[PDB]
């Protein structure tokens, strides 16, 4: 491998998905989003993968947004030691399954929030 990053990169894509069956590629290699259930409420975690990544932290975010101690002030964007940590010599799936068990821990709940996204822009994928 010329670069040692795209090298290193994939490892960590084929490392969480692996660990995550339920795990959803959006964009490939760039956005991976893993729903999860707790107290019978459903979530989605949604991660992003900058070109900058692994050598970058990546970009996650939780809607709807809850009240949580690892809940941004915003309460939309994430922000947690767990994530804090990323690095090339950690496993990115690791850090997923630890915010996931933090709610296990304490179920969330729906923290006040913005009515629509400033630019609200988002149309159906279609039949094709």
């Excluded at 795990?23 to 975690?45: C, G, M, S, W």
């Excluded at 992003?48 to 939309?76: A, C, N, T, W």
């Amino acid at each position: 491998g010329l670069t040692s990053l795209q090298q290193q990169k994939q490892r960590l894509i084929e490392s969480l998905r692996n660990s995550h069956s339920s795990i959803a590629e959006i964009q490939k290699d760039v956005e991976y989003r893993l729903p999860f259930t707790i107290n019978n409420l459903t979530i989605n975690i949604n991660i992003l993968l900058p070109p900058q990544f692994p050598q970058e932290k990546p970009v996650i975010s939780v809607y709807p947004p809850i009240r949580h101690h690892l809940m941004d002030k915003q309460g939309v964007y994430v922000t947690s030691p767990l994530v804090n940590n990323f690095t090339m010599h950690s496993d990115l799936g690791k850090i997923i399954q630890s915010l996931l068990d933090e709610f296990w821990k304490n179920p969330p709940v729906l923290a006040p929030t913005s009515t629509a996204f400033p630019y609200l822009y988002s149309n159906p994928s279609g039949m094709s």
